[PDB]
């Protein structure tokens, strides 16, 4: 309720290394983990390089891509607040779709149910990789421009004729951790394979 | 006699000073730290010491001076470099050898052992003289003859006059008795910075400050002994205008005063002045330093010295004016001076006022600025000098709302308004015609008409053209140049020509380095008269534009001519060009 | 030849202060050592003195002090830091005690800190460039030996990573023009974790013969945090003007220094100044900065790149707004660029150097420096404007030049600014990269480039 | 604590709560011990407000139950810094040592902050925010933390200290500290009063920390948390949509935008508004909330889980 | 509105955003006006 | 039609919205700095005056003994 | 009063009003005598006032209380007091109607602020003294007509 100019807040941020800055706006919208991803920071991102590399040698890139997507969406939110989504192109539209999916699937958690009571690192990194792979493949597809339209036409094509993958992506948060890592990992690998089938099957008939 | 008792940072309390007076400067400690008295509570005093007080010892001696913050004037004041508290930086550096300023230097302001050539006036050994009488003059250097005025608040019948010869300041060049008691005067005069210099009568300013730049000379003229304001923060316009004033301005002397700016900026400017050289109208080549005095107090200097630098400079300018010379002061950064005053007030815990500045900031700024003006001298022979202040302002972010800016705009008569937008658009003068103004034009109209009765009408027409320039600007912005009429198109073209040919200068180019008022007046005539002569013909705008190509080239070149040919030749050329343009406009109609 | 009296007249303890009773002839800023009842030792500084009284501000806190067992042994000194030419290549604590597992400094002189100011007559305009290795600094916002250029940052922004990169990669541009370069590195009030980062960087840098890491942690006593930048500036001044060596100084988080001054001033019962910060904070920062500059009589120089944290991510804060006037530049770190995952997030377009023209020249650096700098500036602005337009015009109506500027903006953001943490870049190859980005536009399109330069370099 | 501003009907809603408060468990709840034995403590109240509360308590038939400690505005100022303490001590004795559920209504805590300010100023102490004493937080903690059930006794203490923001804000030290200490915040907004809704309670600023404990399948409908979390989200997003449409025009809105605006209208009119003498059963309130929610399709109801949707989306 | 440091920051941010949006809308309007002028010339 | 709508929106933003916000920013700046900052100094100044009065009273009482 | 920002011709308007001042005439002895206070005016403005008043020929019925910005700041506070006291004597105790004029009242406000800040008094809005209302009353709240006397201020 008070800005960072508060002397206690400034003193803490002058020393504290990781700031999980919860925003009251997210609390109004009933987003329960409520961490504002624009203002939070973690100066430990460099020391954790070894652990991230050994766990999954491609997590850093997907995390950076997710950060870029979130920042781009927050950037053009002001432009949409003025003009509207009418001028939004294929890249912007797919970026906002992925940002909304990330916001409601990844960044949320109920914590009052076994779906989100405790998310292990493997499940979280698999969700991130799935979402980022979907974003990258969709961007490549709309950049291909096959069928003389491509673009937002291809975006609608993948949101309608390929929306079952989208629904499975947005429901991936419900993978029960009690099933164990060898089961959830297999399920997410299958979902990744199905996503790779899309944007290639969609490109088969040139949209 | 006098020992410290409590040393809390800058504040110092010294006992055994019952005879001390308020605002009397004092020497503190063995290191001869200099500080001013503030409160005389009890038999004790209270002193704020300018330089750092670290290392003071209780019961270290305190030595009174029996004088407020004062400046030692006289010969040798020109050319040198001085600190805020009147400390000669050059001689200090030479004497100490090293670069750092010693903590507690005691070098006198002017070298009292150097010799200057002295010669008295025709006054007799038993005549009568009074304060302000010019009894001798001294050739401090070539072409900057220095008059020796008998100090004010001193008068009496003459007793001794020193015959012409070689003398130093320590010599008793003059001795006289008012009553039976007799007093002997040297060539050195001390005067407090806060107290102004005595005047006989504040005259009405009646002569423009010819800065050598057309935009300042004609569009927004400034008069001798008149305040000026510059919003100088970038674009080097302040440096450009200062150089123009030093080299070409009518003033017989210039006293730059720099307070609390960037140290390297003062280094650059104080290395620029010696490189600056000005040619004499008689063909001689001189150095501007021979008529320039410089008071520079960087940020590293004590805050009190930074506040006192402005008063030191204005007192020096007043002393120069005491012998009837026209002298121009240049406050480098009044915003820095105001910040220094704010810091001093915060040290004194004075009740804060608007935006944190002390409540007397406006009053003190007005008191400082009120010293400028053309003034009749004190004492004979009859002569009249002037002091004009061109002190600049540095508004925060360009928002003319800070109390310093508001007070300056309320006090200063003429504001010239340098614009960063013009600097971005590569404008050498950088003077924004839309915001600048000259409130002294009504008083200057007498000379303006005496020189040329049509010049004032030309200036009014030019102001009207400038006012219509923005109108045509939004006209083109909203519908374009197509909707403009033939007369409207002619007016727009003439406004553009005025902006890009005469209202703008070229500075660096030798032909446009200095713009004489004669050339400026002829250019203004050749522009305005042509504008009218084309205007009443409405004639197709395209047709006159096609057939006035030679006239347009002549109008453009009316500013390309170098001043080498002199006024008689350039005036004749401009008159011939104007006559040719008039013939072309009238015959083709 | 005088052994200082060890008074045992403690007559009042409150907070960090202890008030002695009947000290005979003190000094205002004297330095005093305290031997507590338990035998432990503390060093304290003397604040305002009065009749036989002397308030002492004690380092390391005042816990355990008792008014009948604590001796306060004076010295009669003003903290003359030990200074020598062998001070280089070693890490020092906040107060100067070495912590590099080495010996104390054997001094060639005992210079009093807060040295006397330079005579403004003796200064000289700064000249020549100082290579930093970061393309955004050495191309569009050039730096000259003798400037005082702040590096405005904010909490969370990777200020310290840029500090380490500057400390390592700094060098003299004059390598191709035809080793007297030393980097006094000061860090005030750093975090407990970044201390390990600084120790690692200065323990494997590879050029240890150049740097001197004055280090003052956050949990170190505050007065140490005040004295640390002054110690660093004194050592740099010695190595510059008393040893004829070019010197660079990086002051880290001078906002913490301002807070430390605020803490000290309040303890002296002084009324707080504007916005909480003391009014004399302007004088203090001017005193810290103006020690730089180039001296005519000496071949050395001092160049400052003080890193300042701007709270609330705005410049209206008293410390940044105050230091804006004293200095002549601003190199902002932008939060959005950090979000965009560009490692050096320097907002080049907002950033500027008030005297970048001196660094650009013919003798020093390369001829085309100013031209390429202006062209890059203008083209970046145009690209940002075109991206903003494409956000609202659908990007179908954009002309060819609009797409050229869009791709140039993308390339400049993802290939030029995003230098690696260790990719040292000489100014020549940095300008070669700039020309690589520039040559995309037609030779006639680069309007801001003067003639005889396009013909020289546009051919690649 | 009910947060209010000058002129809003905080006293009226306090009286309504006093008249209507009762147990909810399975809708089953003489109950003399279950009778809340309200203890009303008024500090710095206009005599009209005191007469109003007196008459309301007399009319509601509770005159044999309630208890009133009054410190009127004309009454000496200092007694305002003792009256709430007396009330809390009486409540503690009536609840813990006598086994009666007790409800407390402290009135105009700003009129207590004023007494703290007067006392602190009269002693020349160091001021705090806006000149309030530096220990106002300690006093407010001492005056609030004296309520709550106790394990060893069957009693309980539940207090509703109403508060008046000076200039209708929250950054003011007294409402700020009260929000820090108290486990809830009910907001009465001037905007709702200007639109003439008798309960002006702005449901978006509102908060109760112990909300997740009171509700539950054992004492409420299983969908209560879902229902609340959805209405809150739709109201907040619809308010954002209305703010956007205020500049982009009613035409630029989409179908979802129109649905959100209709939801806002019916929520602020049919749902929030209630009779000054008419209560609403919790199940009736949930039915009304479900009617409000069912405007949107099943897809848009993201917060509500499908299990609760199947049992409630049709009804 | 109630005056506070956070409120001042919010108002400054709103002013900056309004200025940016105004510039963007002016650019869009200029482009639309250019297109309208071209269409009018084509019709003529 | 589109140009008319866009021009109306742009003119409204330039005239109404920005000129509405900027006075609000000025009033907020004045309320904080013009009042709260001034009061803080006045409060502390009165406190320092109280301390000085206490010290003077103590000194006078000691001298009277 | 006249509300007019800095740089506006309000001084010229005041001079024109004072020179053209007269009764409705719908008498010369009781005609308008003008007391012209000048708090904190510039030297050029002072010379302008003197010359303009001497030119209109109405010096016979106009009193100037000039106080330049060079004069001490405290001495500016007593200038309106003296001007209004002289006006009171001329109007009530002699009969002739007085048209009191005070220029640059903001200068008087600044003088009050400086004097109050010197003594460290309780500050009102914008750092001005908390009794500025009473002082501006004691300045302004003297215009009126007294029943038993034919004067008017």
Written overview of the protein:
This is part of a larger assembly, with two copies of chain A, three copies of chain C and two copies of chain E. Chain A is mainly alpha-helical. Chain A has helices at 7-13, 24-28, 49-55, 59-82, 90-106, 121-144, 151-160, 163-171, 181-197, and strands at residues 18-19, 41-42. In chain A, α4 packs across α5 and α5 (90-106) runs antiparallel to α6 (121-144). Chain C has helices at residues 135-138, 159-169, 192-201, 222-241, 254-267, 281-289, 318-326, 335-339, 369-393, 400-416, 427-438, 454-457; strands at residues 6-7, 10-14, 17-20, 31-35, 41-49, 54-58, 71-74, 80-83, 91-92, 109-112, 123-124, 130-131, 151-153, 171-172, 181-190, 211-217, 246-252, 293-295, 301-304, 307-309, 329-330, 352-353. A seven-stranded antiparallel β-sheet of chain C has the order 1-7-4-5-6-3-2, with no helix packed on it. In chain C, strands 9-16-15-17-19-18-11 form a seven-stranded mixed β-sheet, with helices on both faces. Chain C has a two-stranded antiparallel sheet with strand order 8-10. Chain E is 89% helix and 0% strand. The interface between A and C is medium-sized, with 27 and 27 residues.
Radius of gyration of chain E: 18 Å
Strand percentage of chain E lies at under 5%
Radius of gyration of chain C: 25 Å
Strand order of the largest sheet of chain C: 1-7-4-5-6-3-2
Broad shape of chain C: elongated
What's the total helix number of chain C?
Answer: 12
Quick one: biggest sheet of chain E?
A: none
The number of E-state strands of chain E comes to 0
β-strand number of chain C: 22
Strand content of chain C: 15-25%
How many DSSP H or I helices of chain E?
1
Structural class of chain C: alpha+beta
Helix content of chain C: 25-40%
Q: Give the assembly state of these chains.
A: part of a larger assembly
Order of helical and strand elements of chain E: H
Instruction: Please estimate the helix content of chain E.
Output: over 70%
What distance separates the N and C termini of chain C? Answer: 73 Å
Q: Quickly give the structural class of chain E.
A: mainly alpha
Shape of chain E: rod-shaped
Largest sheet of chain C: 7 strands, antiparallel
Termini of chain E, distance in Å?
A: 53 Å
Family (chain A): Belongs to the ATPase alpha/beta chains family.
Protein name (chain A): V-type proton ATPase catalytic subunit A
Organism (chain A): Citrus unshiu (Satsuma mandarin)
GO molecular function, one term (chain A): proton-transporting ATPase activity, rotational mechanism
């Amino acid at each position: 309720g008070g800005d960072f100019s508060d002397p206690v807040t400034s003193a803490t941020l002058s020393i504290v290394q990781v700031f999980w800055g919860l925003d009251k706006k997210l609390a109004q919208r009933k987003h329960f983990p409520s961490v504002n991803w624009l203002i939070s920071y973690s100066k430990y991102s460099t020391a954790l390089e070894s652990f991230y590399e050994q766990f999954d040698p491609d997590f850093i890139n997907i995390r950076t891509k997710a950060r870029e997507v979130l920042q781009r969406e927050d950037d053009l939110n002001e432009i949409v607040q003025l003009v509207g989504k009418d001028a939004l192109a294929e890249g912007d539209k797919i970026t906002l779709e992925t940002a909304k999916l990330l916001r409601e699937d990844y960044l949320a958690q109920n914590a009052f149910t076994p779906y989100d009571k405790f998310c292990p690192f493997y499940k979280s990194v698999w969700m991130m990789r799935n979402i980022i792979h979907f974003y990258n493949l969709a961007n490549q597809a709309v950049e291909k421009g096959a069928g003389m339209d491509g673009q937002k036409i291809t975006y609608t094509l993948i949101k309608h004729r390929l929306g079952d993958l989208f629904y499975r992506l947005v429901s991936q948060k419900f993978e029960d951790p009690a099933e164990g890592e060898p089961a959830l990992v297999a399920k997410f690998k299958k979902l990744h394979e199905d996503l790779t089938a899309g944007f290639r099957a969609l490109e088969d008939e040139t949209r | 006699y006098g020992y410290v008792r409590k040393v809390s940072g800058p504040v110092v309390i010294a006992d055994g000073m019952n005879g001390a007076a308020m605002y009397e400067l004092v020497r503190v400690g063995h290191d001869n730290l200099i500080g001013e008295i503030i409160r005389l509570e009890g038999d004790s005093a209270t002193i704020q010491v300018y330089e750092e007080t670290a290392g003071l010892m209780v019961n270290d001696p305190v030595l009174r001076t029996h004088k407020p913050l004062s400046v030692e004037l006289g010969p040798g004041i020109l050319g040198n470099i001085f600190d805020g508290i009147q400390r000669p930086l050059k001689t200090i550096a030479i004497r100490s050898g090293d670069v750092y300023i010693p903590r507690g230097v005691s070098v006198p302001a002017l070298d009292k052992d150097t010799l200057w050539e002295f010669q008295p006036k025709k006054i007799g050994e038993g005549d009568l003289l009074t304060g302000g009488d010019l009894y001798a003059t001294v050739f401090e250097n070539s072409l900057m003859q220095h008059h020796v005025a008998l100090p004010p608040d001193a008068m009496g019948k003459v007793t001794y006059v020193a015959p012409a010869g070689q003398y130093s300041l320590k010599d008793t060049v003059l001795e006289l008795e008012f009553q039976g008691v007799k007093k002997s005067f040297t060539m050195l005069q001390a005067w407090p910075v806060r107290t102004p210099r005595p005047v006989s009568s504040k005259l009405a300013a009646d002569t423009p400050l010819l800065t050598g730049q057309r935009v300042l000379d004609a569009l927004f003229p400034s008069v001798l002994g008149g305040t000026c304001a510059i919003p100088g923060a970038f674009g080097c316009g302040k440096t450009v205008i200062s150089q123009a004033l030093s080299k070409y301005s009518n003033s017989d002397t210039v006293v730059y005063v720099g307070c609390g700016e960037r140290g390297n900026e003062m280094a650059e400017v104080l290395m620029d002045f010696p490189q600056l050289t000005m040619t004499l109208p008689d063909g001689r080549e001189e150095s501007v330093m021979k008529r320039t005095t410089l008071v520079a107090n960087t940020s590293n200097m004590p805050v009190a010295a930074r506040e006192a630098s402005i008063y030191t400079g204005i007192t020096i300018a007043e002393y120069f004016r005491d012998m009837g010379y026209n002298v121009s002061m240049m406050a480098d950064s009044t915003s820095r001076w105001a910040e220094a005053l704010r810091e001093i007030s915060g040290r004194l815990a004075e009740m804060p006022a608007d935006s944190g500045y002390p409540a007397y900031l406006a009053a003190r700024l007005a008191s400082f600025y009120e010293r400028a003006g053309k003034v009749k001298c004190l004492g004979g022979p009859e002569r009249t000098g002037s002091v004009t202040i061109v002190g600049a302002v540095s508004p925060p972010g360009g928002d003319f709302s800070d109390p310093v800016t508001s007070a300056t705009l309320s006090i200063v008569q003429v504001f010239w308004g340098l614009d960063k937008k013009l600097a971005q658009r590569k404008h050498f003068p950088s003077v924004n015609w839309l915001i600048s103004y000259s409130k002294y034009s009504t008083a200057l109209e007498s000379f303006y008409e005496q020189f040329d009765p049509d010049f004032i009408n030309i200036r009014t027409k030019a102001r009207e053209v400038l006012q219509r320039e923005d109108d045509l600007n939004e006209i083109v912005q909203l519908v374009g140049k197509d909707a403009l009429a033939e007369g409207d198109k002619i007016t727009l073209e003439t406004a553009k020509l005025l902006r890009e040919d005469y209202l703008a200068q070229n500075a660096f180019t030798p032909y446009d380095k200095f713009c004489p008022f004669y050339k400026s007046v002829w250019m203004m005539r050749n522009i305005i008269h042509f504008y009218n002569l084309a205007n009443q013909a409405v004639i197709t705008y395209t047709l006159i534009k096609h057939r006035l190509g030679d006239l347009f080239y002549r109008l453009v070149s009316q500013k390309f001519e170098d001043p080498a040919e002199g006024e008689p030749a350039l005036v004749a050329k401009f008159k011939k060009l104007h006559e040719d343009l008039t013939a072309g406009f009238r015959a083709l109609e | 030849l005088e052994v200082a009296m060890e008074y045992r007249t403690v007559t009042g303890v409150a907070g960090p202060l202890v008030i002695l009773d009947k000290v005979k002839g003190p000094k205002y800023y004297e330095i005093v050592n305290i031997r507590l009842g338990d035998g432990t030792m503390r060093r304290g500084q003397v604040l305002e003195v009065d009749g036989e009284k002397a308030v002492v501000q004690v380092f390391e806190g005042t816990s355990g002090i008792d008014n009948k067992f604590t001796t306060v042994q004076f010295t009669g000194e003003v903290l003359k830091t030990p200074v020598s030419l062998d001070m280089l290549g070693r890490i020092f604590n906040g107060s100067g005690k070495p912590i590099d597992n080495g010996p104390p400094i054997l001094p060639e002189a005992y210079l009093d800190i807060s040295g006397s100011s330079i005579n403004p007559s003796e200064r000289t305009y700064p000249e020549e460039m100082i290579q930093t290795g970061i393309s955004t600094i050495d191309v569009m916002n050039s730096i000259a030996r003798g400037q005082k250029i702040p590096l405005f940052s904010a909490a969370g922004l990777p200020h310290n990573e840029i500090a380490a990169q500057i400390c390592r990669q700094a060098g003299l541009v004059k390598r191709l023009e035809k080793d007297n370069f030393a980097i006094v590195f000061a860090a005030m009030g750093v975090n407990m974790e970044t201390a390990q980062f600084f120790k690692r960087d200065f323990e494997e840098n590879g050029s240890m013969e150049r740097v001197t890491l004055f280090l003052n942690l956050a949990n170190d006593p505050t007065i140490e945090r005040i004295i640390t930048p002054r110690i660093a500036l004194t050592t740099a001044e010695y190595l510059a003007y008393e040893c004829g060596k070019h010197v660079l100084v990086i002051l880290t988080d001078m906002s913490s220094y301002a807070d430390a001054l605020r803490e000290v001033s309040a303890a002296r019962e002084e009324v707080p100044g504007r916005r909480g910060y003391p009014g004399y904070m302007y004088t203090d920062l001017a005193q810290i900065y103006e020690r730089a500059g180039r001296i005519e009589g000496r071949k050395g120089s001092i160049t400052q790149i003080p890193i300042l944290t701007m709270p609330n991510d705005d410049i209206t804060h008293p410390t940044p707004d105050l230091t804006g006037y004293i200095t002549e530049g601003q190199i902002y770190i932008d939060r959005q660029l950090q979000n965009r995952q560009i490692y050096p997030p320097i907002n080049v377009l907002p950033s500027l150097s008030r005297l970048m023209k001196s660094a650009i020249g013919e003798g020093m650096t390369r001829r085309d420096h100013s031209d390429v700098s202006n062209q890059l500036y203008a083209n970046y602005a145009i690209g940002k404007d075109v991206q903003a337009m494409k956000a609202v015009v659908g990007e179908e109506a954009l002309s060819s030049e609009d797409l050229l500027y869009l791709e140039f903006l993308d390339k400049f953001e993802r290939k030029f600014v995003a230098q690696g943490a260790y990719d040292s870049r000489n100014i020549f190859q940095s300008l070669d990269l700039a020309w690589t980005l520039l040559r995309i536009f037609p030779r006639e399109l680069l309007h801001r480039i003067p003639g005889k330069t396009l013909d020289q370099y546009y051919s690649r | 604590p009910l947060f209010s501003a000058a002129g809003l009907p905080h006293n009226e809603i306090a009286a309504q709560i006093c008249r209507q408060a009762g147990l909810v468990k399975r809708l089953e709840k003489d109950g003399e011990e279950d009778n809340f034995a309200i203890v009303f403590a008024a500090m710095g109240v206009n005599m009209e407000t005191a007469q109003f509360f007196k008459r309301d308590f007399e009319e509601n038939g509770s005159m044999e139950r309630v208890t009133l400690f009054l410190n009127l505005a004309n009454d000496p100022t200092i007694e305002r810094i003792i009256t709430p303490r007396i009330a809390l001590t009486t409540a503690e004795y009536l609840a813990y040592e006598c086994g009666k559920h007790v409800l407390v209504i402290l009135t105009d805590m700003s009129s207590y902050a004023d007494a703290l300010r007067e006392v602190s100023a009269a002693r020349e102490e160091v001021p705090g925010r806006r000149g309030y004493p530096g220990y106002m937080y300690t006093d407010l903690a001492q005056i609030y933390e004296r309520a709550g059930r106790i394990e060893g006794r069957k009693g309980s203490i539940t207090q509703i200290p109403i508060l008046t923001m000076p200039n209708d804000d929250i950054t003011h030290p007294t409402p700020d500290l009260t929000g820090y200490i108290t486990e809830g915040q009910i907001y009465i907004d001037r905007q709702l009063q200007n639109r003439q809704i008798y309960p002006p309670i702005n449901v978006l600023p509102s908060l109760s920390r112990l909300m997740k404990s009171a509700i539950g399948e054992g004492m409420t409908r299983r969908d209560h948390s879902d229902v609340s979390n959805q209405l809150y989200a739709n109201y907040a997003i619809g308010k954002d949509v209305q703010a956007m449409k205020a500049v982009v025009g009613e035409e630029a809105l989409s179908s979802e935008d129109l649905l959100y605006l209709e939801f806002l209208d019916k929520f602020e009119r049919k749902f929030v508004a209630q009779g000054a003498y008419d209560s609403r059963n919790i199940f009736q309130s949930l039915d009304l909330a479900w009617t409000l929610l069912r405007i949107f399709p099943r897809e848009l109801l993201h917060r509500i889980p499908g299990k609760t949707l199947d049992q409630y989306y049709s009804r | 509105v109630v005056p506070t440091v956070t409120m001042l920051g919010v108002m400054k941010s709103r002013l900056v955003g309004a200025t940016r949006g105004h510039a963007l809308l002016k650019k869009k309007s200029d482009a639309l006006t250019v297109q309208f002028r071209q269409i009018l010339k084509n019709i003529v | 039609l589109t140009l008319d709508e866009a021009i109306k929106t742009t003119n409204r933003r330039v005239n109404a919205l920005e000129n509405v916000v900027k006075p609000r920013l000025e009033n907020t700046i004045t309320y904080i700095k013009g009042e709260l900052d001034e009061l803080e100094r006045e409060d502390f100044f009165r406190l320092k005056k109280i301390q000085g009065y206490k010290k003077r009273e103590i000194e006078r009482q000691l001298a009277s003994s």
